[PDB]
Amino acid sequence: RSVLKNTSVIDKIESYVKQYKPVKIDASKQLQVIESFEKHAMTNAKETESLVSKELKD
Amino acid sequence: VSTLIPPKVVSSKNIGSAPNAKRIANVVHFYKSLPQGPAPAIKANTRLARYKAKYFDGDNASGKPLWHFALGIIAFGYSMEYYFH
């Protein structure tokens, strides 16, 4: 800022950045469809696991 | 677009393939097979069965009883000679 001796905007853009210093929050939105994806995952996985654990000894 | 999932689709896959049909054939083929030559019924008698077991198995398998059967006709027809001429 003190490099520009003709400052005139640096307070403006500095308080503009400090204004938007709370930029935007993130997106932790998925907690319902993602658990359905891993629900189908655990479903078909335990189907496969029980079937192969049976058929190996079979 | 997401984590796609074919590692675990084995549970309903295991019908259509070719070793499945061979497997469901030969697991049925193996249980009722008798283990070590059991129940062969090596002793039997019906007043003519010891003739078969001594002569007409695959061990001896010789045609000499037919010889005896031929001898039986030599016992029969020659005696029929004694009955005819």
Closest partner residue to B9 among A44, A49, A55, by Cβ? Answer: A44
| A58: contact with B, CB 8 A cutoff | yes
- Residues A14, A27 contacting (CB under 8 angstroms): no
Nearest to B7 by CA among A34, A50, A33, A48: A48
| A52: contact with B, CB 8 A cutoff | yes
Q: Measured between beta carbons, which residues in chain A are less than 8 angstroms from residue B2? A: 37
- How far is the C-alpha of B11 from the C-alpha of B13, rounded, in Å? 6
- Residues B20, B14 contacting (CB under 8 angstroms): yes
Structure's resolution in angstroms? 3.6
* B67 three-class SS: helix
Asked if B10 and A52 come within 8 Å (Cβ–Cβ), the reply is yes
- How far is the C-alpha of B70 from the C-alpha of B64, rounded, in Å? 9
